[PDB]
Every structure is written in structure tokens, then in C-alpha cells.
Amino acid sequence: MDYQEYQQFLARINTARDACVAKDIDVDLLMARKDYFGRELCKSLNIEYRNDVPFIDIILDIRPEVDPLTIDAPHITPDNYLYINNVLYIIDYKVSVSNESSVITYDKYYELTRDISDRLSIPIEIVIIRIDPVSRDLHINSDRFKELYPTIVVDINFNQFFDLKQLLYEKFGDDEEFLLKVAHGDFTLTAPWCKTGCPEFWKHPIYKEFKMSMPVPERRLFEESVKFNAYESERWNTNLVKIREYTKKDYSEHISKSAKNIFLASGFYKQPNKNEISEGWTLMVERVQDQREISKSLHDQKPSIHFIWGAHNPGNSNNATFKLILLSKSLQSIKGISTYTEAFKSLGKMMDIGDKAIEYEEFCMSLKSKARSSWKQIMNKKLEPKQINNALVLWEQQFMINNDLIDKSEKLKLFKNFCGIGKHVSKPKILDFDDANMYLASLTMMEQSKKILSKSNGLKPDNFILNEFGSRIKDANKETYDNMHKIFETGYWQCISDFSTLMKNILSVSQYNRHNTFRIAMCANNNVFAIVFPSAKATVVYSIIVLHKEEENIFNPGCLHGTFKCMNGYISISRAIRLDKERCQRIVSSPGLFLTTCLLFKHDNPTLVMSDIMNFSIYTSLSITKSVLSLTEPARYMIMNSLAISSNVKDYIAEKFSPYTKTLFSVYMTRLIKNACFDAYDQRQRVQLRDIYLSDYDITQKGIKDNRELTSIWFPGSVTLKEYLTQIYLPFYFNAKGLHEKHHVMVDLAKTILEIECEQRENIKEIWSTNCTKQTVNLKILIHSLCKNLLADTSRHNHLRNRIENRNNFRRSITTISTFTSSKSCLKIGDFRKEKEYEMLRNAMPNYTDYISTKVFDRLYELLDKKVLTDKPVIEQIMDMMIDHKKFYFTFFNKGQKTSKDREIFVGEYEAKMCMYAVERIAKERCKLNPDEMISEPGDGKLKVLEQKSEQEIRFLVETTRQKNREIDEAIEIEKLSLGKAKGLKMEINADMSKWSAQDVFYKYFWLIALDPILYPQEKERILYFMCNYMDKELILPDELLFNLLDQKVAYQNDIIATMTNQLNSNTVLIKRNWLQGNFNYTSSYVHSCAMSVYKEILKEAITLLDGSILVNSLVHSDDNQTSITIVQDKMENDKIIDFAMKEFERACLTFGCQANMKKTYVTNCIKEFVSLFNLYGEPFSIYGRFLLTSVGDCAYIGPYEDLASRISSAQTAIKHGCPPSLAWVSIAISHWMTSLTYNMLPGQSNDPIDYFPAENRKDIPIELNGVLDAPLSMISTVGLESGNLYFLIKLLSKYTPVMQKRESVVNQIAEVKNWKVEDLTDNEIFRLKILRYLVLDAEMDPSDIMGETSDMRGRSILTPRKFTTAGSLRKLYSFSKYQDRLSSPGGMVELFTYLLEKPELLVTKGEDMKDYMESVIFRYNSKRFKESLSIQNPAQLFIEQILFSHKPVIDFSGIRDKYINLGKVTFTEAYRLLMRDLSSLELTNDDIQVIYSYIILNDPMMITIANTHILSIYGSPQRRMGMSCSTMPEFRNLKLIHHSPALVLRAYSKNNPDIQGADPTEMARDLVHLKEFVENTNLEEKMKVRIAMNEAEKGQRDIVFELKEMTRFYQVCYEYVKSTEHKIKVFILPAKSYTTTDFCSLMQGNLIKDKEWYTVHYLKQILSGGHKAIMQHNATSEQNIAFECFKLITHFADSFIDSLSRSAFLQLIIDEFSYKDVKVSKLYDIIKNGYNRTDFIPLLFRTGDLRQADLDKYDAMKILIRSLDYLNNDIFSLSRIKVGLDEFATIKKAHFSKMVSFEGPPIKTGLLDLTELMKSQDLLNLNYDNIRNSNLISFSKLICCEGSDNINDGLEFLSDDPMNFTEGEAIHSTPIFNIYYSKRGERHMTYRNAIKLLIERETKIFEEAFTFSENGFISPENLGCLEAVVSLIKLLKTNEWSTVIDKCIHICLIKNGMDHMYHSFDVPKCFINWVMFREFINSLPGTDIPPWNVMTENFKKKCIALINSKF
RNA sequence: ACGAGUGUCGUACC
RNA sequence: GGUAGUACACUACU
RNA sequence: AGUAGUGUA
Ligand SMILES: [Mg+2]
Ligand SMILES: [Zn+2]
């Protein structure tokens, strides 16, 4: 941890050049890690630190009286010992990831100490403390030791040692001897998976083709390699080395040629520019005109928004019946003649209620009351229309189509030519997007929309989002709050809210619409209506009707049918719209999308116009068509390529960009993109980089400058680069998934697949070539690279085969693998004609391969039941299937993604799944070792990897450039020399691969299989036979696609499908070279990595020819490549290098069969983009807008709480990806609004709970009771929706704890709960506490409990609606048929249930046996929810059903009442009322409050830590986020009590045998003991037994299913208790790098409070608590950390800012009276003295005496006499630094000065400076000399306490005169130009005192000339009289900080001028209490306009005038 | 009419 | 020409 | 363990 020791290790690594000493380096590194952990553990435990203390020594120490030689002490050396309570504990520190060494050392030490334990009559305990370096989880075996130490708070980081190990291994990676020397064990191969290999593989036609393709020597080499057995051979790498040596000549020749190409390359690469963009645009428009039908008519446009809107009418009433009457009258009174005017008038007559409004209301109310009285739908009773006036009414807003009221001809005209009901190869018609008239029409449309919608609403901006989240959003960003207020005031919000409400009403009324009825939908607007036409994927037909007084005052986005005159104005009818419920639901959610988009685009940008942003967002948010889809996604490639250094944007536009402009908005956005391309080319040079700050240990202040110089894209303004990237990339997420149509997408996907297959069949005939032919692989280079990479990878780890089998469950059963037991679909081949009934297709097409789709688990059940599969180890069965399954069949379906063209998705059969599983797991485990591979990297860690690569490339650039240009810089401190100096080049190739799986040479994987060392020859033969049979796979065409292709009746021109299928005579097509998408990810990625390694070699050699330095980092996921190249050379310009690098990148991709997408491949100098993730310049960046937009996404629609928890997930992910707090809060508000809208809980609505509960606002109601979340954003991110209860409890603590403990730790504050008075609690608090006590917890719980259930062990759902829903067909499931047979079997259920009781662990864990699996599969069918999931369900239909059933009795209140002490289903409102009634009778007591606190907070260490962070937080100096970084969330529960896996522990507990398969005998015993203790102390077994007994007695018969359910919850709780370290991968973008839990919490809290700036957070006490997950914590930690921080801060502050002489007196004075963090510093000093950590404060102790020479001896042991020390420190006056020897220096570690604000004490008055305020000073404590000398007199005036000082020179004497540090910045001279700033030791003239002197002189001169009221000067007697007047004035009035700072500044000026005597003699002038003339004088004050004091003097005068006027 | 489409579709049926 | 089972939301500062 | 959702390729 020590930085000097880190430097020492770095020097050892750098200077080392022998692999024999690198082992010494690594061993020393491991010892340093162990000793560091031991020292930190001893500090935490507060025990004296020892290492390898002799056992005889410890025996003598514990028993000095006994004579030595009484017994031979064992030679073992314990790390440390501890003797308390007559028990000796032998402690051993271990820093390992495993327990093998721990257990063997435990056994050895125990055996060797038994004899001494018996003799000396002392029990000896062997305690092994083990820490896991990668996840800091502590493991302790001795429970007695853990009893001694209840809280162990070891919080340390091992990242430094990992970095050194990585540096050593990368330096000596090329040395195979070093790898062998550091290898663990030898090369070991497990037992062969198969006993025999395929003999028919050699006869396979595919193998014959491959063999004939290869030349003869390669055929021989392939046969030898596949027939090679590593275990039999003397060396495993015998054949690998032979092949590598054979191919070395060709490999070296290829590398040398490719390197020689650098000279032949010119400087001209594919630069994007305006000419290329224009030519590409011309080619694109030509291609689009050829492929489409271009229309120049505006009347051919399609609706941009399927809606028309008009402002409301304040004069008219908003009652529903009045609106209906008004609509009927307006429809009837249409004047004029038109096509449908008579139909509209007839409809208005049909809906004419007349004057019988009361009768209509009564009829509708009676119907609704009848409907709502039943949980189920009312059946068998027919609704009969009632005639009211001329209206035949069936329901509210439902009317008959009366044949008498409408002519038949008019009715058919309307229904067919208008609504399309009863209605009934050319090119798709699209508008001309390049036509000037068409673009002018689009501009006119957008201008009209802006004009109509920019006006004010005229109504209150009050709404749910604002009311419930305005405070949070305002505190986060007042500007965001103001933007929201403006948005809600404008008319865009009213229009989109009206459209959403109206569309929800349309969806509600369309469910029960009949064929002869039409519905009327109404919204809050009294002028906007909807008429829903009859309808039967369900569709909705609606027409929007708008009433407006003035014509042309309507908002028409190309949806209007016509505007007609009526009574009292005009009526406008929109054209009929037919939409899918999926698009309708998006429209309903659209307000959230609109608000999110507007706030994202406007955030932190004053140069943008909110009107323009909303004008764009209203169209993108409501876009539900493919027209905008065709533009959003290609825009990324177009604009990003244009900004790039090298890109083929011209070819991209010409060949791929295909705008689909069916709408005027699409035309407008096409023009926007076109302009943005040229602008992006023009403005690529305005990107600038921040000044890098390098500390040589970490990088801070890195990235890209924030200057708004780039032009905005979609709307006028200026943006930063980050905002520009957001504007480029966010629009892709405006698209909607599932917009495609199955018919067309199946046709296109089949066409693409068959076209690729046909092209491969015809054109592609060569497999191996040397000239980089398309779809061809260079054989020699491939083989050589594969050999090299395989050698390196398998040399890295010696047990690769064992690791594969262990991690992939190869040795375990088939039923224990998730991918083989899932509910995903799989293909089944065979005769299934009966189930499928299709008949016509079967008869008409002979060669039809019959197939059916089934679930994976069902297929596994079938194969197990038919004995095709067994429960033997899975790998043996997999290889058996590799031989048996000769024919592979696949089918495909469309993904339905959000891109313009859908993606084909392939489904395979079970045997193919298993074979590919084996191959892919082998490839995966070899990819894990390779650093370049990125699929093996867990998700979201790729951001951290990108950051690390960028940081090391920055460091390499700086170091290499400085090292090379040292000579030139020395010569400078010449222009000709500067010309010839070396320059740095940085290159980022963000690349894409074209047709990764479609066009790939599958033969290159044969070599990967054959050259693999870890496989046996028989395994290789079987796998190669599988691959050969895979290359003969057949694609089964889908039945629906075949149906449509057979129902055409007109022959297609060139039907590729018919050609490939023999004129539709077969449904199967043979696919050979296209390994199917997604099946061979790891293998393809490995070969991609090998290709990039060859590229790296080529680049390194080529740069070697240039005598330069290069660093190449390549990241490869599957087909997405991120290659960054850093070059520092001087021979040639950068253009030649860029051209050469790009040409060789393309050539290297083509060499290995890959093909880079040059259209989508672009080169940048700074920006990295690997997988939707960006690294701007060392600084991580991500588009969190996608997570922000997914806040309104679909959910399970289970209930109000379940729905909310799903969307808070998206909010939290957005927070993790860098979303600012205000936008995160907006997303949370939108999620709450969406849920409340779904369940009709919005304010004022029926299910709104605010009235029924004692709460002022919905923040007071619990989430489970339908409140809104109220908690800090850091809490929401960390604990995740438990934050509601946590925040409520913390607020209760902060409100009711006594003042003495108010600033104590959470455990102490909870211990003080017994003193609470329950009578003082408010009604809301009482209600919430009762809810927590009785609804969340159990009545049996007692405050005396020591262990209890954690919040993760219990659910939170209370009010969940129930639905009467049919299960579905489920006919095709063989397992379901077996389950039905078993159910119909006599009593089979009792046996199956009995088996599940006998093996209860099967309920929660996977079974390890076929019988166990088959029983579980049969059992799951009992649960209704599983069957519902099995049936396909539409989320759109579920959402509408939840809306409709909101008033029906759905809540089962019996279950809720069963929760507390001791009917029919109930509605939401009645449930609220009943819950309040039930809770009224219950009582609450201090005992109950203690139970709540103990069971909610004291259980979880994470909950305790979060509560401590909230209570004890101190917020420091604000600062702008300069350089961000990634940091993963650490583990909050470090202590581990269970070692074994939870499944194994549960299996052992179900039985009583600690000895289980795969379970360590003795290790499982303690886990079983712990689990039994947990069960007994929580009384789970007793509670379950009592519950089942009571239920059995109540029912009268044994409810066996109830017993199963009880066992399920019991084992669920047991599983949650015994769950081990999950170690989730959760990374965060944070202002700084965090290493420990406290650092992470500080960074989270400081980052998630304000949008503008982030704060430094330190904690008053120690936040972390040492405890276990389910054990109560009643012990708080010590204050030693506070003492350490205090005295480190004190020593270093005194050294830095105090003169050498005054330092000791300063220390003594501050020790005597001051206090740190509410703790007296004398007490902290006593803690340090009377403690076992005194070697960290040797200089501090020396200055205060102490030492006693024991500390010096201990320090020497860590590596010196007292008098020698005293003599040596004669010249040194440093409090923090002392010299024990002539060169040895004992020092105290530094602490950040931001914590100095925690010191409180009496003033330290010396000279005129009061040092207390200096410690409290914020500006003047900075270490940099420049920053100190450049501070202001406003800050400096705080330190002035003169009381009669004459000279500032003697006043400032009490300041440090040692040299300070200053930041010197230098340029780098690289193609991306940037400056690095590094602090360096300054010379003598720059000291703290000198900086203060310069500050004083400059600022006082400025202030003097600012306040020379008289012309003579500052010292003139008249000016002095004016100063006397002003000081008397300010003394006479109330003190203000303006007055104080002005007084201090004038005082310091007078001290400089030596006017102090009169200053202290200032009094009221004799000419002056005439307040009138004081006012006259101050109003006559000649205030100057000097800029710093201009605002200051005016404010001071104004405040004085206001105060003196308020006085009178 | 609307959704989709350089694949004949959905658009309630006999 | 005839046929076309199918119980309910919003109801508002507008 | 099952189910749902989201992001990624
Ligand atoms: Mg990419
Ligand atoms: Zn003074």
C-alpha cells in the first residue's frame, strides 16, 4: 500500500530481465500482500501486530514462570497469537481465493499444538483468518474468536498488488520459461469423455472436401494433429510446436511483406468531405427513385401523428353528458354538402340523447353497478338496447347503428370507403424527400404545429409528476424544474396528454364494442372527441372529432379529413385510423417519452429553444410507423462517419441509406440529417481535450472539453461533444419494437438467407487463398496464429480441461443445466400432422419435412421418458448424440427488433443444442484466458476495460513522447530541431464486421478443434464429425411463410425461394457455409482475436522499421472490434501511417475469413465505441437515454407495486450509466405516473388512496399501499426499494432520538429507542409503524431475538388483483399430457406430493437425478402462473384488462387479514377501508418499535451501513465533474458464515448426512450447525408446524398442497440465509475511482445530490458495521479511525501551513482545547497512545515525549536509540516527518484537507491571523502555490484578528516558510493536442508566506483603488474620515457578512498602510444620532464601478439603506 | 381510410 | 341477400 | 428454482 514500496516493486519489475528472478518478484509480491493484510487486520482488531512469532516465544510470553525446555515447542511459526480469558488463540493470516491451504494449515497447527494444550492446562484454538482478494469477503473458522470480536471492519483494497502482478506477467508473458516456472502443478488431463472415436468421420464428404482443399503436407499435419494424444506424448505441446515451426517461414514472410507495405502506402485515405457526401446523396436518391414510387403530391402523405387536436373551450361545461349532447348537436348541424356529411349527420342523430340526460345517466349507472358487483364477467344475460330520444343505447357511450336513422347507401359508403369495414405488384409510395415543394410543405407543417402548440394552456400546470416530485427535481436542478414547468405550461403538453388520455379511453371502449355499435371516447379537453367504429392481432378503428370556434385553429399533422361548419363554430373530422393495440399502448405511454426526450435534449444547454425541442419531440414520441425507423438508425453511421478521420460515408449513403419518407415529418427529418452530414464534416476540428492531470498513480481531470461550439442537429443551437453524441445516438431509441408485419418480414428474411446461400453455391468455390479473396482464409497464417494463441492460452493455465468440466457441469447430469431445462422453444422433427391440425400444404407438397415447436423442458422430459437420454454425466451423452444425430434441422422466425430491417432468428433441436453447448463451452473457457476477448468478460465490465485501455494508452503516449523528445526539449531550453522531433499519433478503429455468421469460412474451426491440446483424439473425432454433419444442416421454411407463398396466384418474377425449394416442392434448403447466427459466438470471437493478434504483429514490425514505439490494444466481442493504436515516431507524417494501418486492418480481417464493414467502420482520434459504450478520452460515456426511455416500458402487470418495482429498475440502471439526479428523478416520477395511470390511482381518480389513509400527500403512503417512493437517490440506487422503509425509519430516528445521541451511530440511536414516547408520534408515523409491525413482520417476533429474517427473505406485495383467466390449450406438451394422465390416474397426486415432501430441496433447487427432474416438471403444472406463462399473452391486452377490471372485486382481503391476528373478494377502495379499520384496533408500543428497528435495520449490515451513511454524512467542497471513472459496487456483507454452495447446504440439511456427493465432510458439518442455529433461533420450523396443524384442524383433512407450499417458503428462507457471495457485476460511472466501501458510498452520495457539481463526503463516525446477514447487531465500532484521521490531518496541516518554530506550540495548544468530529482531541490522543498502533505516529509521539523505545524497536522490526533520535532531529522541526537514522525517515500518512472543517476549538490568535479560521478556510488550504497566490481578499479577510497589529510582515511570520508545490503544465505534441499538468517541487522563493504576501499586496492595492473615495489617495485624511464614517455606520447597524468582509478588507489595507492606531480609534464623527444625514451621506456615497467590488459595494449600500429604512 | 410492402397481405363472414 | 357469440374504463382546473 | 422486464451482440 505504501507508495514508496510500490515504487520499489515497480523498479524491481522494470530492471528485471531474467525469468529466474521474476519468480522472486512474484513471491515477494505475495508476501507483501499477506503482510499488508495482516497489518490492516491487526489494526482493525486492535491487537499488537506480530509475524511468524516462534511458538516457544509465545509459550514463554504466556507462561514466564514455567521453566524452558519443559517441552519441545513445534517448529511451526504462527502469524500471531492472542491470550485472553486463559485461552490462547493461534491466528494465521491467509490471502487466498480457496480454503485448501487454510484447512491443511488448520489441521497441521491443531495436531502440533494438542500436546502443549494438554500439558500447560491451557486450551489452544487454531484460528484461520482468510480474505478473498478479488471479492473482499472475510472467512473465519473459529466461532469463539468471532464471539470475542463481534464487529470486524477490515476494509482494504488489493488492487495495487494485482496491477504489479499484471505488469510483471505482461513484461514476461513472451517468456515461456517464466510461465512454466510460475505454473501451478503440471499439465493434467481428466478422464476421456468417450472411449471410442468416430471411424466414419474420415469418410464424410465434407471432410473429403476439406482434405482435398488443403495441400498434401497440410493434410498430413491435420491428420497427425487430430490423431495426437497429449497425455500419451512426453510433452503436450509436441505437435503444436512442430506445426508452428513448420508454418514459421510463411508467417514471417507474410508479416515482413505487410510491414514493408508501410513505405509503399501513400498519405491519401478515405477522408469524408462534402464532395463525397454529395455524390453519395445523388447515388442514394437515384437508387431510391428506382426502388420506390415517388409522389410529388401532398395528398399522398400519411399521418405524421394519428391525431388532431384543438384547444379547449372554457365557456362550455366539461360534464360527460353535456359533452355528449354537444357532440351530437355539432355533428347534426353540419352545413354544406360533402362525401360523408350525411353519414356524419346520421351518426349525430343516432347518438342524440336529447333532454333525457337524467334517464341516460340512471340507465348507465344501473348497468355499471350490476357489472361491478361480480368478480367474473356477467354471462348468460343479454344486454338489450334502450331507446332514449333518437338514441338506441346499449351501454354508456355505446349506441346502435340504427338502420332507420341512416340511408343504406350512406351507411355502406361510410363503413367501406371511410372506416375500411367490409372493404374487398406496384411499388411502395413515398414522398419525394428531395423535392423543394415537398420540403417547403414539411416546413409549413412544422411551423403551423409550432404556432398552434407554443401558446399557453391557460390551465394550471398542476399534475401528478410535479406535485409528487417537484421538490426532488428542484433540489437536484432548479433549471430542470423550470424547464418542466415551462413544458407543462405550453400547449404541446396539453395536446400529448389529451391524446394519451383519449387513446386510453379508446382502448377501454373498444373491448366490448360490437359489430352494430359505435363508441364515443372523451378526454379532459371538452372539444376533442373520438368515435370508435365496429371492429372484430386485434385492431382499433377510431376517428378524432375536434370542435373549434375559428377555422384553421386546429393542429393537423397530416391526419385531417375535413373541416365543416356547424353551430357555434367549426367541426373537424380526422380520417379513420386503424391501429394495433401494441402501437396504441405506445401512444398511451407517449407523454413520458415526450417529457424524457425534451428534458434530455434541453438539459444543461441555454443555447437551445424549448419550443424547438418540443416541436421535434412531439413528432418523434408519437411516431409509430417505419418511416422514422428508416431514419433514426442510419443517422448514427452517416453523421459519425462524417465527423470521423477516415470513413467510407459516401459508399454508406450510396449503398445502404434508404430513407422511407411516407410522412412530411420524415421528409423534414431527412433534410435535417442531410444538413447534419455536411455540418459534421465542417465541425470535426472543434473537438478539444481537457488538460490531463497525471499523479503518476492515477489519472484525474481527463476527457473532452465542454465548449458549446458544435452545431445542433435536429434543431437550432450549439452543443458540446457529449450532447452532440447524445443527439446522434438517442434517436435510435425513439423506435418501437414489433412494428414489423410477419408476412413481409418472413418473405424478406427468407430472401436474404436464400440469396446468400445461392451466391455461396455459385460464386464461392475456393477455401484457401493468399491474395485476401472474399470469403477465403489464408491457411498458413491461420494455422500459425492458432498454434501460437493455443500455446499461450493453455500454458497460462494447467488445469483447463478440469476447469471446463467443473464450470460447465460436464460431469453432472443433464437435468442440472439451465440451458437444457428452460422454457425456451426448440424444434421437434417427426410425424406431427394430427397435433398440427396445413392439410392442403401437406398434400400439395411431397418433400415436406414435418416439424413442430415445443419447449426445451418438455423435450427433455420426453427424451428422458423414452430413454433416449439418461442421468449419466452430460458430456458422455452429448458425444453419443454427436455420433447418433446425423441430420440437423433448423427453422427461423423474425426477432421483431426496433431496426429498419428485422433480424432473422434461428431455432434448433435439442441434440443440436447439446452438441453446440459442448463445443461452445470449450471455446468459452479458452476465451476466458485471452485478454482481447470480451464475451467472456461479464456484462457492463467492458466499460471498465475500455477505460483501463484508454488510461494506459494515455500514459504510454505521455511517457514515450517525453522520453523521445527529452533531447529536443533540452535544446529548446531551434525551430529546425523542433521540426525533426518525434510526434505522437493516436488512432481508434471502431469497426464492424459484415455478415459475421452468414459469410464465414466454417472450415477454419476444424483446425481450431484439431490443434486443441486439451482434447483426446476420440473427442476430436466426434466433435469434427459433429461439425461435418452441421455443415449439412437443412433450414425448414416456416409453415406460415409457405402458406402465403402458396396463396399468391401470380408467379413472382425471379422467385429465389421457389428456385431454392424446387418450385415449392420441398420446405427444406441446404445451408453449408452459414453457421447460424449466435451459435458459435465464442469460437468466432477466438478466431477474430487471433486475426487481431496477427494485425498487432504486423503493426509492431512496421513501426520497428520506423524506429518508433507502438502500443496496440484490440477488443473483440463477436463481430464488433475496437482497435486503438498509439504510435510515437519521427520518420514520416501521420497520413501515411493512417493509410497503412487501415489498409492492413482490412487485409488482416480478410486474411482470417472476416470482412470489415468499411461503410460502418470509422476512425477517430479520441472517441472509442466498443459495444454501445463510449470512451471519449479515458472518460467513460454511455447513452443513459435508452434506460431513461424504457421507464414507460411493458411489465408483468401483476399489480400496482409489482409494476412500479419493474420500472424503478430502469431508473436505477440509468443512474448507473451516468444519468444526472434530476433526470433520474424525472424518470422515477414518470414510472410512478405510468403505474398509477394503469391502475387508476392518479390524484382525484377512484382508486386514489390519499383520502382513505392518514397522509397529507402520497409520499407518506407506503409503496405497498400505493404511495410514491421517497428516499435519497443514493439509497434508491443501493438498497433498491427497501429505501422507503429505511428512509422512514431514519427520519423517525433523527426526529425522536435524544439530542445527546442525535449524532451517534445508528446502532446507538436504535438502542435509545426504548426511551421514545409513543404518544408523541403523529398519526402518519403511527399508521406506517403499525403497517411495518403487523403487515410486514410477524406478531410472534420479540425484541429479545438475536437472529431474525432479513428484508430480502420476505415479500412486500399486499394488494395484488386476482383474475379469472383460462390456462390455455397446452396440447403440444408431452409433459402436460403425462401430468393430465397422472391427475386422471387414481390418486397419483398423493404419491407425487409425498415424494416432494420426502425430498423438499427439489422445491427450490434443481434436481440431480432424472426421477427428481421428472417429478418437478410434473409438479410445476399445478401452479396456475406457470401455465399462464406457458400460454402466449399480449402485454397490450393485459394492460387493458387491468384498466377495465379496476372497479371489480379483485383483492382477496382474507389473505391480507391472515397476516395479523386471525367473506369475498374486495375492491381497492374497500380494501383500503378494511385495512384502516383492522389497524385501528391494533396497538403500538416501544416494544413494537424496537422489534421493527431490529428486524428491518439491525439484521442487514448493508442496511446498517446505508443508515450510517445517511445519518453521519458531511458534505465538502463542491467541484465540477472533470474526469469520470468506472468503479464497481463492493460487497457490504463481508463476513461469510457458510462456505458451501446454497444448494449443497440445503441438500445436506434435508437429510442429516454431512457427507454428500461433492461436499467436504468436515466443512459441511459447521454449515449444517449454522443453518440449524438459524432455524432454531428464528422458530421457522415451529411456526410452520403450528400453521399446518391449525390449517389441518380447520379444514378437517390433510391439505398436502398446503404442506408443500409451507415447505417451499421454509426452504426459500433457508436458501436466502445460506446464499453465498453472489458477487454481482454492477459498475458505476463516478467522479473518482473508488476502492473501498466507504469511498464508494462517499462518491455515490456526493454524485447524486446536485446536477452541476459533485461533493466530497466524509463521515462523522465509522459507517461500516461488522456483522452477519441475519444476526442482530448491538455493538458499535471503536473511534480509532477518527483518531488516526485527526492526527494525520493535524501533523500534515501544521507542517504545510505553520512556521517551524510555532509548530510544536500549535500542536500542544490544539491538543489541549480542540476537538475533532465531536470528540475531544485529547481523548483521541489517549486512544492512540493506549493502543497497539503506535508505529504510525512516531513523529507525533516524539514531539509530545512518549516513544519509550518500544515503538522504535517495533519500527525497526517492521523494517535506533532515543538519544540518537533526539540529536538527529535538532535541525528538523517537522511534526509529520522525523529521521530515525541518517537517511531513514519515519513519517505519518497524509489526509485530505477537506476534513479540516471538522475541528472545533478556541481561537488561536497570533499576530493578526487567527489560525482557527485558517483551518476552517476553504480556498487557502490548497497545496498549489499558484492557487494560493491567486486567491482573493474576500477569502483572506476571514483570517484577520488584528487587535492592534502594526505590520503585516511581522503578522505573517507565523506561516510556513518551506517551499510549496505548484502545477507545471507541458504540451505533448501529438495529433490530438493536449496538455498534462503535474505537481512538482518548487524552489525557495515560493512559500506559503510569500504567496500570502503577494495575495495581500495585489488584492489590497485593487481594493484601495476601488475605495479611494477622495482623489488624494487612500491615506488622505479626508478618505480616512470617510472610512471612519463607514465603520461607525456598520458598527451601529446589524452585522452582515458584507459589512464584516468590507470591514476586514479596509482593516488589512490600513495595517499595510500602518493606520492601525486610528483604525482602532475609529468612532462616531463629531459632525455626525442623525440617521437622516447618515442616509443622505450613504446615498451620496461615490461607489466605484471596479468589477470585483462593483456588485459588492452596491449590495452593501442597498442593504444598509434597507436596514435603516426598516428601523424607522 | 389506416397498418405493412420494390412478395400477391391484414382490412368480419357465407 | 343474409349472418356477425363478445357485462365496462375515463367521467377531469378544460 | 420458476416467471417477467431491460440492455448488449
Ligand atoms: Mg462497433
Ligand atoms: Zn487592527
Swiss-Prot record:
Its main location: host cell. One of its GO terms (molecular function) is nucleotide binding. It is found in: Host Golgi apparatus; Host endoplasmic reticulum; Host endoplasmic reticulum-Golgi intermediate compartment; Virion. It comes from the Viruses. Residues 1-185 are annotated as: Endonuclease. Pfam families: Bunya_RdRp, L_protein_N, L_thumb_ring_vir. Mg(2+) binds at D1120. Residues 974-1162 form the RdRp catalytic domain. Mn(2+) 2 binds at D52, D79. GO terms for biological process: DNA-templated transcription; viral RNA genome replication. Classified as His(+) endonuclease since it has a histidine upstream of the active site that coordinates the first cation. Belongs to the Bunyavirales RNA polymerase family. The N-terminus contains the endonuclease activity (endoN). The central region contains the RdRp activity. The C-terminus contains the cap-binding region. Homomultimer. Interacts with the glycoprotein N; this interaction allows efficient polymerase packaging into virus particles. Interacts with nucleoprotein N. RNA-dependent RNA polymerase, which is responsible for the replication and transcription of the viral RNA genome using antigenomic RNA as an intermediate. During transcription, synthesizes subgenomic RNAs and assures their capping by a cap-snatching mechanism, which involves the endonuclease activity cleaving the host capped pre-mRNAs. These short capped RNAs are then used as primers for viral transcription. The 3'-end of subgenomic mRNAs molecules are not polyadenylated. During replication, the polymerase binds the 5' and 3' vRNA extremities at distinct sites. This is RNA-directed RNA polymerase L. It comes from Bunyavirus La Crosse. The gene is L.
